[PDB]
Design a protein around this ligand. Sequence first.
Ligand SMILES: NC(=O)C[C@H](NC(=O)c1c[nH]nc1-c1ccccc1F)c1cccc(Cl)c1
Length: 295
Amino acid sequence: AFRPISVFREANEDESGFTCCAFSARERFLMLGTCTGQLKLYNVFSGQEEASYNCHNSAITHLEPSRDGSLLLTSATWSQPLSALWGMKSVFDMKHSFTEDHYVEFSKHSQDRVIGTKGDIAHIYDIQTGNKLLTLFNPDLANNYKRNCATFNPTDDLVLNDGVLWDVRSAQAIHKFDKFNMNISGVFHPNGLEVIINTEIWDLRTFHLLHTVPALDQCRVVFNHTGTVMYGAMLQMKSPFGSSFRTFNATDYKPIATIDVKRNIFDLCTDTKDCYLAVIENQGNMDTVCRLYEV
Ligand SMILES: NC(=O)C[C@H](NC(=O)c1c[nH]nc1-c1ccccc1F)c1cccc(Cl)c1
């Protein structure tokens, strides 16, 4: 089951403004973005704030720490810059910013690059210099996914942007996947063999359709660290998700559990050891709690 372990809200605040979360390198410490553009570091078990940092002048939508715990990507709503890279080492300082990119991820095998999305366009930046290396967009192959998010594959040699597979080295589109929905652009399976674009599961080798999984419709998807479980929550208030998330066996895409928290979800994340699941849920207008579950 998902046994509730603990709950906490943003300390002191009349209205709790948690918008997103990620587990840090440090065990029992969660990072949370707020609707006022702050990064908070919380003890997940005590529910006590340890540290607060000013990142953006608008709501944090999404964040991602680097595996080495040295770097953090943030994205905001109406700020400029919209996304940024932060040093989490000595002083908490902005390394680089990414202009109009509303979503950013690290590269996967080696975290030496950032991939940002602006609408249908993907930008690849170098972490050290912060120089835009590549702009990926082909007007001939675009799907114009409303909620497009560009992503590297596990080995960083491919990118999926707007349902288009790109060879990173040659910067050539090598395959466009057919469009079946208006919103969701898809992710790589951590096994490196499959891409998941909404309900469709494509083989990377043959580009054949392996499965249809209707339950994934309009879902953002995140895998547990071992790549054994896939979490999905249907997109929709400022609330990006409805009231439920679903788990699937990542090996065979069979359903496991449907969890309905009866409250709108802003975000979820699992820790490095996949013991715990953190969910940001609205109680109400904006009064979010972080709920911690034992997986
Ligand atoms: N940290 C993660 O990548 C987790 C991921 N978060 C988002 O996708 C998310 C949280 N706010 N806005 C978003 C979001 C919404 C739409 C498009 C891109 C986005 F990043 C997720 C995946 C599966 C279920 C859920 Cl409940 C969340």
